[PDB]
Design a protein around this ligand. Structure first.
Ligand code: 559
Length: 126
């Protein structure tokens, strides 16, 4: 049998909280732009491998990540360093490349989201 894992942790009241220009930009600008993109929908929540009848997804992907979880981490002040968020976006993209194969439709879609991501963080405030 196959059960999805629990989503990644998103909120923990023991972790200290800080508001930074970079974390606010990642929420208010970057996540916003990726979220309306044409290709955002597969990435807006955890991959539901039970629904999709994919029992190997979580055999292959051991560090799940998605924009819904990133949104939550940002808005719940889970991240301390901006690079924690940028690492979660890279995990999301790379999970797609790992599970799938070069040139697959969803890989082309992830590649385009990644290109938008990189253009947006080029303008990360200091
Ligand atoms: C992210 C990610 N990384 N690999 C996958 N995905 C993926 C995640 C969710 C879904 C999906 C599929 C149907 C639905 N109703 N909601 C979400 C499809 C995906 N994939 C997908 C395949 C083709 C296209 Cl055009 C879009 C998404 C395939 C595969 C499971």
């Amino acid at each position: 049998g196959s059960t999805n894992p629990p989503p990644p942790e998103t909120s923990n009241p023991n972790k200290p909280k800080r508001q930074t220009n970079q974390l606010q930009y990642l929420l208010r600008v970057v996540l916003k732009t990726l979220w309306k993109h044409q290709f955002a929908w597969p990435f807006q929540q955890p991959v539901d491998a039970v629904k999709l009848n994919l029992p190997d997804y979580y055999k292959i992907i051991k560090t799940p990540m998605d924009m819904g979880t990133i949104k939550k981490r940002l808005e719940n002040n889970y991240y301390w360093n901006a690079q924690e968020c940028i690492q979660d976006f890279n995990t999301m993209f790379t999970n797609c490349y790992i599970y799938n194969k070069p040139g697959d439709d969803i890989v082309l879609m992830a590649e385009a989201l990644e290109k938008l991501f990189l253009q947006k963080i080029n303008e990360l405030p200091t």
